[PDB]
Amino acid sequence: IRPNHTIYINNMNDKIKKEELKRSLYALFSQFGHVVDIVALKTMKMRGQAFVIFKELGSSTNALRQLQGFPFYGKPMRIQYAKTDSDIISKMPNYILFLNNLPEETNEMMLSMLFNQFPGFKEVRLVPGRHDIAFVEFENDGQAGAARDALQGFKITPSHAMKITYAKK
Amino acid sequence: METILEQQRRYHEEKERLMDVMAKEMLTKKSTLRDQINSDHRTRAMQDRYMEVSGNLRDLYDDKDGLRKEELNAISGPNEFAEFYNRLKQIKEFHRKHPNEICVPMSVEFEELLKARENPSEEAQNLVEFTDEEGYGRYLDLHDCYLKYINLKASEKLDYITYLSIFDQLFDIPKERKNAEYKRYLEMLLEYLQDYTDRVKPLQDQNELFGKIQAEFEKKWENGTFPGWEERAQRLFSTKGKSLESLDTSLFAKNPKSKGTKRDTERNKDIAFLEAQIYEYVEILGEQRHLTHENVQRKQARTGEEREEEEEEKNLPLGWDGKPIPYWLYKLHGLNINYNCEICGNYTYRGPKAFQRHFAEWRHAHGMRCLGIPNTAHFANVTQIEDAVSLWAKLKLQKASERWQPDTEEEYEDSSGNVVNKKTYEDLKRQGLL
Amino acid sequence: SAFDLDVVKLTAQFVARNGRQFLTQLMQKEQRNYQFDFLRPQHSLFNYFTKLVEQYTKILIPPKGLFSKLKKEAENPREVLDQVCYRVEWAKFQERERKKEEEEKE
Amino acid sequence: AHPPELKKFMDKKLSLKLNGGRHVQGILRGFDPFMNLVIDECVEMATSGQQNNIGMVVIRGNSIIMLEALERV
Amino acid sequence: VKLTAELIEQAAQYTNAVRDRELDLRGYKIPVIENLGATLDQFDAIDFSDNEIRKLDGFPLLRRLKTLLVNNNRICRIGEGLDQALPCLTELILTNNSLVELGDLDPLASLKSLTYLSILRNPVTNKKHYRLYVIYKVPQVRVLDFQKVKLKERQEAEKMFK
Amino acid sequence: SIGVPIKVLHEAEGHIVTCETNTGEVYRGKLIEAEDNMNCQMSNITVTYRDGRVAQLEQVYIRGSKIRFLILPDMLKNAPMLK
Amino acid sequence: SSKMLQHIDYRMRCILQDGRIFIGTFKAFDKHMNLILCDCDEFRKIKPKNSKQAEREEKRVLGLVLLRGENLVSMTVEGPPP
Amino acid sequence: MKLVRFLMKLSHETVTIELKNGTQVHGTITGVDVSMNTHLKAVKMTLKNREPVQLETLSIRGNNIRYFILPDSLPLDTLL
RNA sequence: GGAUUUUUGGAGCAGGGAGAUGGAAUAGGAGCUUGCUCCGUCCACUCCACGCAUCGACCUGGUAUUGCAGUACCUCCAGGAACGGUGC
């Protein structure tokens, strides 16, 4: 799963109506970040659950990591990143870290989405010499730290876990 | 919690700054009448700021009456001194300065750059309390008064002249009833005049003046204010006379005068007071009402162009001899021809000569600087901005092609014999591996 | 220095409780094992000490807030206009005096 | 002058709401570009559950508030 | 950094996810709360997240207030006269603030339309009988902090604090 | 000529509108076919007549002399009218 | 002069013909001046029928409403241009 | 000769229009057109059993206006 | 270019009865202030036909769902009605 603006939340009360539900979700997600839109239906296809669109993937991730199992309408609901992009966003330590145990089958596109999850990095270099290795540099060292702490033990193609460490001098 | 000292110091600083700002405003001048009215309200406001500080200071004696015992000791001291130091021995490492201890009330009770505004004084003015026909003290608010006089009278034999001749008198004969709703209408009109007088005079002691006027209505008008020789005295609101002062005083304690009529001394006191306020404002601003009457007369009789405007408030080239050059020379030089330079702010040039020079002439140099595209040869004779952009893009691509970037081409094989560019080469070189 | 300003204010508050030029709340505290070099007369901070003292005197005098209340300032547009014109008039006198001094220097 | 798009609604059973709270069910057969209608077997039910059919009525577009067609036509 | 009218005029006022007319303050850090009148009553929600707001007071006279977002705050205490300026204000997103005392929400009873509030991660939330004092002193609120008020807890909140 | 609000209602044709007529009638449903005479033949509408019971019916036809208002899709905020 | 085009693009509270209101940023206009209100608010009266209960004005979300010339009566200007 | 130009020959003169919605608006109307289309500018309007509301830019309709009241010192011969 | 689909308009009208029930700090006229009596504008409770029926949220419990979606309003019982407005 990747960082998206929409933060999904499931297992809210179904005895709570959709209007007050989206009201309370907006209230609890304004403290997390910029609530831009709210996708909440009351039909059994998405009943009892709702996805609130943050104007930041950092904001939706903040809400998902702060409110994991959050006491919400009678029973703590579970919040995480949306599976894909929402309609709203759809219409919308070092400089470099070395990635190890990387798949020699991995795709550059998914690799770029992952390295740019934290604000867009400089590049990723999947080494065509010594296989199963990368060297990725960031346009921001703060994003570098964030993505590297997230990536130490990163899960992509779970057949392996790829790790990002502070690349030496 | 030292109230004897801290309150006095704060009030003293605030009041010094307030008096200084007011004295500066009254020692300088404002050039406009709008400046004059805004500054007069501001001077009343500075006096009210000084007054609020003084009202907070003159009551803070509930701690002083008992602190005169505690601060009057010459036996204690350095013990409490060292204790205050033991508290003041917290970290003060906020290594920086800020003057916000004694220099603030200057920018609290001072003036502004383009219009005289302090910190609080940014929105204080006669803007919401001034009429356009008024001018911040030149005309009055009486057009609605005339409309209401019409809607009350129901006659077409009442104009500005009759309205002024009726509404100027203080105690002159009414043309409209003080026993009918005409009294309430006059009360409302004199209320508008009193609002003009209350917005025009913020430097007069309004509380004392209103108290003196209430004392006047309670003492000198109800105590025979219009002397005479039945004919001794009559009532302004009652419409009843007295055989003498004795008859007046004995009939003011009579039965029909107290409550035995709709025009008695209890149900008609407000109407008498409104008539009094109206007549008093008229007779005080007779020079203001006289200026308004002269205004009305001139604005009603003057010409329309000046009246509306007062209510609202060949081309040949120039030769070397400062003369216009011949028409045939003009035709030859093709100056009549207009060339639009959009990048130059939709500028227009005459003459293809000037037009061609214009690309190295300054205004186009700027236009292209603003665009972010260097005024180089390649863009000369391009004028539309979208075109300049697109061309700049393809030229970016061109120079990018012909340039030599080692970072991207220079291909490096690793010890494992497979190729990287030198960028990744040095990357994973110092990144512990290559 | 906010702490230094507060300390100078405290020194002025202690000098408002001084009884003589020698016997007050600063004398012993000068040598009482704590740092106080602000009583020295040459350091520019003595000016802040003295100005705090002048304000402490103008606020600790009888009308400064000790046992009486002055209301011609707290409710007085008449006194306000008087004192404001008087400050402007002292300003005008000083303007004429500075002009005289400049002419004499010329 | 525009004619309406009533050629599909022609020959359809329509329950229309006319002004005064009236409910008339009838058959559209041919209309005038002003929507000036003639309704076959037009049954205009009063406020109560009592209704009557009147056959041929030139109804108003000033009084017709809206109309619905119960078939897909 | 003084709170001013530029940080009001450059703000966003729109119809947000909850169909409320919200004025938003992204990145404000304003520790001075005043002068919101020129909001012009085209708004019902007032969000001022990322603010250094030390106190809960200082708001002007609006008739149609619907939501108040004091999210990510630094409030020390709360001012009282919020009710005459918020006649029918109902939602208060007031978590992440330094509320402790049972008297830190004493002005809350003046809210007539109060329906929902969130004051989480505050030293006042963790206390026993805290939701009791909540559902007592805000008698109008039927849900607070993502859980409705109930007849049994309301009876207990009446019994206690007597 | 042709009015741009009417052009926005044309851009909202086919899709769902939420109109309100003279009698408070709130019809929320697909407004299919319409004219410059504001005579719109619509379908799939929940017509309530302002009484609270909206009924889900087909092939309604609402004029415009009664038309109090009509909500048209927000996604037309980029319609060529306003820009 | 087609005057409205100078005050358009900014938010006005228009009236209905039945005493209600429609507050929004006026988008575009026509001959008959039937209005196009974007993200419109419909602030109407609620029948009090009592002196012991207040008088409230509730507004629902209309969005982009194309209000007919039978609703456009008088429209004050109340909002900044969004 | 319809009253079109009698209504339209007016700009920013203190007049009093009566809207057929039981309301009155007095002030300096901005400009009038041929079909009784007049705007309001800084106008004070009193509604049916209501308050003296102020309008900075209000757009008064034509047939929803019930009457007009001109100035008192205006020659109707020179106006119509 | 005011005769059925947008601006020379079909708008405006007033809130069901009654009882030795109450109120008009500041506003009623008469019996030529107060004390008392009458009458033409509401609300609060109580009586009748709680104005009724309909439905849309809504307050309480109990009750099912764990459900990846660009939205009139969505599980169900029951109520007491705090609301919107329709037919008389």
Side-chain angles (χ1 to χ4, degrees), chain A residues 3 27 33 40 48 50 58 63 69 71 74 76 82 93 103 119-120 128-129 134 142 144-147 150 153 158 161 167, chain B residues 23 45 55 66 74 77-78 82 99 105 116 120 124 135 137 154 174 180 202 211 215 224 227-228 233 241 253 256 260 272 276 286 301 304 314-434, chain C residues 2 12 16 19 41 62-63 65 74 77 91, chain D residues 1 3-4 20-21 26 30 33 46 49 55 61 69, chain E residues 5 11-12 17 27 31 37-38 45 58 60 79 81 85 87 103 107 109 123 139 157, chain F residues 3 5 12 14 24 29 34 52 55 64 73 79-80, chain G residues 19 24 28 48 54 63 69 79-82, chain H residues 22 27 31 42 52 62 71 75:
Chain B
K314 272 196 62 191
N315 195 38
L316 281 175
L318 266 283
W320 57 267
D321 47 334
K323 273 157 211 166
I325 63 167
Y327 190 71
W328 60 267
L329 235 140
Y330 174 80
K331 280 233 156 143
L332 180 47
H333 251 257
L335 285 154
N336 49 320
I337 297 298
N338 297 324
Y339 294 114
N340 174 86
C341 183
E342 163 190 326
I343 309 185
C344 273
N346 263 265
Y347 208 60
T348 288
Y349 300 74
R350 281 212 227 85
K353 308 292 322 309
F355 184 25
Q356 293 231 5
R357 310 178 309 128
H358 120 243
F359 299 84
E361 302 188 302
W362 172 79
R363 173 192 329 286
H364 203 83
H366 175 55
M368 301 273 317
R369 294 166 21 210
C370 168
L371 242 196
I373 298 170
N375 208 52
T376 358
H378 308 225
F379 313 94
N381 289 290
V382 164
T383 50
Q384 306 188 335
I385 282 192
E386 51 274 86
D387 292 13
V389 178
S390 36
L391 192 75
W392 169 234
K394 64 145 263 192
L395 194 157
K396 256 177 173 283
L397 296 149
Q398 266 204 354
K399 179 186 303 167
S401 330
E402 292 273 311
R403 234 184 172 189
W404 153 238
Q405 30 284 311
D407 313 337
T408 81
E409 310 172 24
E410 182 157 3
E411 48 211 345
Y412 264 78
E413 110 176 278
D414 55 359
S415 290
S416 154
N418 220 35
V419 229
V420 307
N421 55 60
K422 194 237 200 59
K423 200 168 57 176
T424 60
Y425 162 60
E426 293 267 9
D427 285 317
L428 300 145
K429 161 179 193 197
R430 277 336 294 121
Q431 284 187 29
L433 234 113
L434 283 188

